[PDB]
Amino acid sequence: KVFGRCELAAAMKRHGLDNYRGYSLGNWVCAAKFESNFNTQATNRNTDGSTDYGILQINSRWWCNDGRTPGSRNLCNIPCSALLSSDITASVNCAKKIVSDGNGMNAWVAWRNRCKGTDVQAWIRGCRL
Numbered sequence: 001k002v003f004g005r006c007e008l009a010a011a012m013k014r015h016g017l018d019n020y021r022g023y024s025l026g027n028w029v030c031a032a033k034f035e036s037n038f039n040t041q042a043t044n045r046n047t048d049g050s051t052d053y054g055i056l057q058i059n060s061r062w063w064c065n066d067g068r069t070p071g072s073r074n075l076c077n078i079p080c081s082a083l084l085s086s087d088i089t090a091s092v093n094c095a096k097k098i099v100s101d102g103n104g105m106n107a108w109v110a111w112r113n114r115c116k117g118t119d120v121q122a123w124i125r126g127c128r129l
């Protein structure tokens with residue numbers, strides 16, 4: 001599913017991401033924009049053999065099981081395929097664990113490089129939330 005901008009903002013808010021670990025909703029929408037262009041079915045293969053899945057491009061080395069990432073973990077206790085669903089619950093619940101890991105949203109390199117320190121509230125402007 002490709003979410004609209006305000007549609008994803010509302011879904012993220014409904015699932016409790018607004019201000020989660022102190023990160024305002026615009027931070028989460030901005031991260032999703034540059035990770036996946038709001039497409040739940042986005043995937044990306046990394047040089048080390050791991051794969052990133054879903055709207056927030058969550059990686060199989062630590063967070064989900066795809067059966068093809070040797071030596072990896074599954075800390076969100078989900079198949080990586082669950083991160084591709086039209087229902088964002090699995091991506092949100094796993095992102096909450098990731099952002100609590102110690103480095104906040106810096107875990108998403110694209111957030112650090114493209115969202116951090118910017119006017120992220122622009123990503124939710126105009127939305128009925």
Ligand SMILES: [Cl-]
Nearest residue numbers: 004005033038
């Ligand atoms: Cl957009």
Ligand SMILES: [Cl-]
Nearest residue numbers: 024025026121
């Ligand atoms: Cl915001």
Ligand SMILES: [Cl-]
Nearest residue numbers: 067068069070
């Ligand atoms: Cl594996």
Ligand SMILES: [Cl-]
Nearest residue numbers: 065078079080
């Ligand atoms: Cl599994």
Ligand SMILES: [Cl-]
Nearest residue numbers: 021103104105
């Ligand atoms: Cl933080």
Ligand code: NA
Nearest residue numbers: 060064072073
């Ligand atoms: Na894994």
